[PDB]
Amino acid sequence: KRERDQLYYECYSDVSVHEEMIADRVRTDAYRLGILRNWAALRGKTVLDVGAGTGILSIFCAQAGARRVYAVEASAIWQQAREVVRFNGLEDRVHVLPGPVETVELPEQVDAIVSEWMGYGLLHESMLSSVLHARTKWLKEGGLLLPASAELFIVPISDQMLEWRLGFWSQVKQHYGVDMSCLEGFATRCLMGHSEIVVQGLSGEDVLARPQRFAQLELSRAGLEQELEAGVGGRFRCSCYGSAPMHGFAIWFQVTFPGGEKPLVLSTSPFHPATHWKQALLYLNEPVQVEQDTDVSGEITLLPSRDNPRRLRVLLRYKVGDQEEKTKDFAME
Amino acid sequence: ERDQLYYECYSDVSVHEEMIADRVRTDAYRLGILRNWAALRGKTVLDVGAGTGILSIFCAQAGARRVYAVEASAIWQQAREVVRFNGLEDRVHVLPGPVETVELPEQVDAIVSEWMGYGLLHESMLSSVLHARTKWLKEGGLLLPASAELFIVPISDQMLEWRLGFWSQVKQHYGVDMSCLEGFATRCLMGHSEIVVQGLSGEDVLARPQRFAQLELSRAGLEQELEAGVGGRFRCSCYGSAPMHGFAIWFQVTFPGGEKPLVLSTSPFHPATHWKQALLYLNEPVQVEQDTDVSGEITLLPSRDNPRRLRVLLRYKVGDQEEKTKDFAMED
Ligand SMILES: Nc1ncnc2c1ncn2[C@@H]1O[C@H](CSCC[C@H](N)C(=O)O)[C@@H](O)[C@H]1O
Ligand SMILES: Nc1ncnc2c1ncn2[C@@H]1O[C@H](CSCC[C@H](N)C(=O)O)[C@@H](O)[C@H]1O
Ligand SMILES: CC(C)Oc1ccc(-c2c[nH]cc2CN(C)CCN)cc1
Ligand SMILES: CC(C)Oc1ccc(-c2c[nH]cc2CN(C)CCN)cc1
Ligand SMILES: [Cl-]
Ligand SMILES: [Cl-]
Ligand SMILES: [Cl-]
Ligand SMILES: [Cl-]
Ligand SMILES: [Cl-]
Numbered sequence: 001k002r003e004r005d006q007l008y009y010e011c012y013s014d015v016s017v018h019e020e021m022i023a024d025r026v027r028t029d030a031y032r033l034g035i036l037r038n039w040a041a042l043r044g045k046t047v048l049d050v051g052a053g054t055g056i057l058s059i060f061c062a063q064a065g066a067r068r069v070y071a072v073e074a075s076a077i078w079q080q081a082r083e084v085v086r087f088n089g090l091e092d093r094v095h096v097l098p099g100p101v102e103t104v105e106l107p108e109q110v111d112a113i114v115s116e117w118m119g120y121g122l123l124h125e126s127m128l129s130s131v132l133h134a135r136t137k138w139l140k141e142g143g144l145l146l147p148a149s150a151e152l153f154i155v156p157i158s159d160q161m162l163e164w165r166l167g168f169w170s171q172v173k174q175h176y177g178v179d180m181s182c183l184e185g186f187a188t189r190c191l192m193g194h195s196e197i198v199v200q201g202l203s204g205e206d207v208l209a210r211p212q213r214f215a216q217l218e219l220s221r222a223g224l225e226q227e228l229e230a231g232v233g234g235r236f237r238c239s240c241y242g243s244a245p246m247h248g249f250a251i252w253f254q255v256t257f258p259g260g261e262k263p264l265v266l267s268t269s270p271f272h273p274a275t276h277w278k279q280a281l282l283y284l285n286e287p288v289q290v291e292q293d294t295d296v297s298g299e300i301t302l303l304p305s306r307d308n309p310r311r312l313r314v315l316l317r318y319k320v321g322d323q324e325e326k327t328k329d330f331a332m333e
Numbered sequence: 334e335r336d337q338l339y340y341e342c343y344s345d346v347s348v349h350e351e352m353i354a355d356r357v358r359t360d361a362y363r364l365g366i367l368r369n370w371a372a373l374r375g376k377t378v379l380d381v382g383a384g385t386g387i388l389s390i391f392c393a394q395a396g397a398r399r400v401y402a403v404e405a406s407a408i409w410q411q412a413r414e415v416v417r418f419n420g421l422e423d424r425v426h427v428l429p430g431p432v433e434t435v436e437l438p439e440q441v442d443a444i445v446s447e448w449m450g451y452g453l454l455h456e457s458m459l460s461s462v463l464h465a466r467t468k469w470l471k472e473g474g475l476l477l478p479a480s481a482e483l484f485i486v487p488i489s490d491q492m493l494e495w496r497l498g499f500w501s502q503v504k505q506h507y508g509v510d511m512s513c514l515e516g517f518a519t520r521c522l523m524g525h526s527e528i529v530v531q532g533l534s535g536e537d538v539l540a541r542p543q544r545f546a547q548l549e550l551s552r553a554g555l556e557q558e559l560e561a562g563v564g565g566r567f568r569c570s571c572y573g574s575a576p577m578h579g580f581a582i583w584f585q586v587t588f589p590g591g592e593k594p595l596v597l598s599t600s601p602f603h604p605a606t607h608w609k610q611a612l613l614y615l616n617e618p619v620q621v622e623q624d625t626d627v628s629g630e631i632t633l634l635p636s637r638d639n640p641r642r643l644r645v646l647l648r649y650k651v652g653d654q655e656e657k658t659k660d661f662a663m664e665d
Contacts, residue, residue, distance in 0.1 A: 015514075015521040019499055025506070032507060059509045080517055087513040168350055176359060178390045182418040183346075186411055190346035 005100070008125070008310055009075035018054050018077065021116070024276040028056070030266035031116065034146055034257030035060040037264065038112075041144045042066050045111035050101050050134050051127065055081030057114055058094050066112075071096045072104050072134075101134045112144035120199050121280040122152055122253040123232065123302050124312040124332050128217075132225045145219050147255035152215040153269070154236050154251050156208040156296050158244040159281065161200070165191060166287075188286055192247065197314060197332045198281040202250055202270040208290065209238035211269070214300055229303070231315075237297035240290045246320065248283040251300075282316055282330055294321045305331060336431070339456070339641050340406035349385045349408065352447070355607040359387070361597040362447060365477055365588030366391045369443075372475055372591050373397045376442035381432045381465050382458065386412035386425070388445055393424045400425045401441070403432045432465045443475035451530050452611035453483060453584040454563065454633050455643035455663050463556045476550050478586035478597065485567055485582045486542040487627045487651075488533060489575040490612065496522060497618075523578070523614045528645060528661045532609040533581055533601040539621065540569040542600070545631055562646075564632035571625040577651065579614040582631070613647055613661055625652045636662055 011017055022028055035042070035057070043065035049058040052071035058081070061069045071081060071094055082096040097104055113135055119125035135145060166187050172180040215232045217224065240246075252268040268277045290296070298318035305311040314330040342348065353359055366373070366388070374396035380389040383402035389412070392400045402412055402425055413427045428435050444466060450456035466476065497518055503511040545565035548555065571577075585598040599608040621627075629649035636642040645661040 015518045019496065019518075022503060022507075022511075023499070028507060054511065054514065056503075056507070056509055056511075063508065080514055083513055084509075084511055088510055165350065168354070172353065172387075175356070176353075176363060176387065176391075177394065178387055178415070179419055180353075180385065180387075180415055182414050183385070183411055186414075187346045187350075 004308065004310070005074075012053065012075040013077055020276050022054070022056060026273050026275050027116070027266065030257070030264060031057055031114075031146075032060055034264045034266075035064050035114065037259055037261045038144060038146065038257070039064045040260045041112060046070070046108060048072065048106070048110040048113045048134060048138055050113060050115040050131050051117065052081050052096065053077055053116075055084045055094070055096060057116065058085070058096075059088060059090060061112075061114060062090050062093050067093065069094045070106055070110065072101045073098065074100045101130050106138060109140045110138050110143065111140055112146065113139050114146040118150075118253065118255065118277065119312070120277060120332060121197065121251055121302060121312050121314070122150060123228070123304075124310075126228075126304050126310045126312075129225055129228060132219065135219070136222070136225075144258070147219075147257050147266070149219060149256045150215075150217040151213050151254050151256075152217075152232065152251060152302070153211040153253070154214050154249050154300055155211040156238065156240065156246050156290070157202060157206050157248060157250045157281070158208055159200075159202065159206055159247045162191065162247055162283075163245065192283045192287070193285050194283075195328065195330050197312065197330045198283065199278050199333060200281050201274055201278045202281070204271045207250070207270060208240045208242075208244055208246060209296065212236040212238050215302070231301040231303040233299075233301045235297070235299050237295065240292065240294045240296065242292045244290060245287040246284070246290045246296075247287050248281060249300075249316070249318075250279045250281050251314075252277075252279050280314075280332075282314060282328070284326075285328070288320050288323070290320065296320055298325075335639075335641075336405075343384065343406040343408055351607050352384070353387060357604050357606050358447070358597065361588070361595060362388055362445075362477075363391050365595045365597075366395050366445065368588065368595060369475060369477070369591045370395045373443060377401070377439060378443045378445060379403065379432075379437070379441045379465060379469055381444060381446040381462050382448060383412050383427065384408060384447075386415045386427065388447065389425050390415070390419060390421060392443075392445060393421050397443075398424065401435075401437050402427045403435050404429065405431045432461050437469060440471045441469050441474065442471055443477065444470055445477040449481070449584065449586060449608070450643065451608060451663060452528060452582055452633060452643050452645070453481060454559070455641075457559075457635055457641045457643075459550075460556055460559060463550065466550070475589065478588050479550055480587045481548040481550070481584055482544055483546040483548075483563070483582065483584050483633075484542045484600065485545050485580055485631060486569065487539040487571065487577050487621070488537050488579060488581045488612065489539055490531070490533065490537060490578045492531065493522065493578050493614070494576065519617050523618075524616055525614075526659060526661050527665065528643065528663045529612040529614065530609055530664060531612050532605055533612075535602055537581070538601060539575055539577060540571045540627060543567040543569050546633075560635065562632040562634045564630065564646075566628075566630050568626070568628040571621045571623060571627060573623045575621055576618045577615070577621045577627075578618055579612055580631075580647070580649070581610040581612050582645075583608070583610045613645060613659070615649075616659070619651050619654065621651065627651050629656075
């Protein structure tokens with residue numbers, strides 16, 4: 001079933017997703033400046049924009065002096081990108097090509113590749129293998145990748161929003177004169193007992209320890225394609241700041257653009273301004289009380305599902321202080 | 334088999350959290366039940382769709398000697414827990430299964446139910462309640478609520494206006510002109526034939542809201558009239574100059590007094606509720622002026638494939654423009 005790809009691209013054929021991406025100021029301005037600061041590597045050069053969407057990133061490349069930009073797009077939105085390119089008078093420099101980047105035939109190797117491939121938890125959608133497949137095939141030796149690298153972080157969390165949802169049932173008497181405190185367990189089983197990856201914004205005040213980096217993806221490195229199938233991650237460890245009910249873990253990513261100037265980082269940390277990626281939350285089955293200097297440690301692996309390769313899977317093993325090591329397997333909403 | 338998937342939606346906590354957190358809804362049901370304490374003292378009540386059991390416990394608190402709390406989804410176990418926890422195991426009996434196939438020991442003096450979906454009739458729970466009235470309600474029995482009215486008005490959704498205008502703003506933000514995508518945006522967002530559940534304010538309302546249906550729930554033969562369609566004709570005149578994006582529909586229900594009668598509205602001129610309003614978009618904007626004639630017909634139906642999903646047939650005419658038709662289905 002390669003018709004699994006048709007239902008994936010149908011999401012990107014609609015305007016709403018692209019509105020959400022372009023409305024994400026942090027994301028779109030990171031790409032704008034990231035491209036601009038690498039003018040030296042881009043003036044006069046050829047560029048491959050993998051998954052051009054509405055074509056905004058391809059136009060940034062042309063505005064930074066690129067002589068030719070190949071904007072490859074697999075969904076029907078390619079029609080709108082051609083229209084936008086034509087509308088800005090850039091048809092002679094920006095050429096939009098339909099179809100997947102795997103099957104696309106360009107007339108030449110390229111000097112640089114740009115792509116916004118990051119999904120939720122970085123690797124939801126599994127777009128990275130397309131980008132790496134295109135690097136190996138089309139990018140010249142020592143050509144520019146934008147962004148050039150990625151890192152993943154994990155940290156234990158106490159989600160205050162969830163806390164109020166669990167506590168809701170104890171507030172019922174004071175409003176309506178009926179005691180529903182006994183449904184606290186039920187709500188915990190409903191909201192924490194399931195095995196889905198929740199994509200939700202957190203505050204920095206919900207963070208219970210130093211965020212630990214558990215993966216580092218240098219996109220130039222050959223053989224990185226093969227490692228994504230086996231999984232991304234490894235062990236983590238940290239000690240908590242204080243007293244709180246730990247609900248689970250959050251994960252987020254960052255990506256780095258090189259300078260020419262200094263490097264630009266695009267982060268999805270809760271200590272930074274929000275993005276449409278938000279954070280990926282991994283809830284325990286029930287809350288666990290931790291104290292100042294409670295040592296939390298464990299193992300995490302990000303990989304694609306068996307059923308749908310584009311869907312993200314997270315295998316977590318964890319140990320909260322004294323407790324026995326527990327396990328939980330998640331899949332994106 | 335089809336009905337089992339519907340009940341499963343009410344097995345999760347989130348849906349009941351949302352309903353109980355709707356203070357306008359829950360206070361109206363509390364206060365509506367409390368108003369009829371005289372008629373309910375020492376009487377028996379059926380609670381169709383008991384959920385977590387909160388409405389049954391209002392009836393027991395109001396003085397009913399016996400309440401049968403009927404609930405088809407697995408949440409009946411949570412309703413049993415709450416009853417026992419509140420010490421009302423003698424006065425409230427939680428009976429699992431659908432209300433169609435439940436067996437009570439007696440006929441009841443009153444029926445309470447919160448049955449209203451998005452656009453009132455989404456979910457098609459009203460048939461279950463009307464069947465329960467015929468089978469279990471005594472003569473001169475009480476229905477809470479007792480009636481329902483449906484309203485419609487042309488609207489100018491600001492949230493949509495922002496989303497359509499977005500593509501002209503890209504130049505100012507990022508230095509790339511994408512104003513050429515406005516038509517595409519409109520075709521995606523307005524050309525889809527789905528009923529959008531969204532909250533509006535008073536500024537969004539473009540003319541005097543018009544009632545197009547009344548449902549007296551005691552009326553016999555109403556169950557058959559629901560399958561045929563609930564609806565009517567409407568006409569109104571626009572207040573002033575604005576871009577019309579479609580129609581909003583909403584409802585109200587009325588509890589009898591026993592004191593003045595209590596009205597639970599989901600109008601945008603009254604306090605907000607989880608029902609919000611149900612929006613029916615045109616295929617594109619139509620610019621209107623003061624005293625512009627908007628008229629049409631609306632019919633609320635069950636969908637072809639799925640009887641519990643709400644369908645809306647809309648005929649509409651706006652000013653000099655010819656009469657147009659559009660078929661909507663509730664958000665998938
Ligand atoms: N293998 C592949 N080949 C070509 N395009 C792909 C692809 N996999 C995903 N895409 C496309 O890549 C885009 C990812 S979203 C990024 C969109 C664009 N850069 C913007 O900022 O607006 C989508 O439009 C999707 O349809
Ligand atoms: N035919 C039927 N028989 C019994 N219960 C039904 C039913 N159709 C729907 N229901 C139930 O009716 C409920 C409607 S929601 C209202 C729940 C509750 N009265 C409250 O205010 O919180 C749902 O929980 C659903 O499971
Ligand atoms: C269809 C499933 C598997 O994939 C999607 C999940 C989410 C989205 C989505 C919703 N809003 C914005 C996006 C895209 N975004 C995450 C940046 C992409 N480089 C799209 C596809
Ligand atoms: C076909 C089914 C799934 O449609 C539903 C759609 C929405 C809901 C829902 C979400 N929050 C609250 C509700 C219930 N509410 C409308 C009051 C009902 N008496 C339930 C069923
Ligand atoms: Cl497509
Ligand atoms: Cl082109
Ligand atoms: Cl990085
Ligand atoms: Cl767990
Ligand atoms: Cl009414």
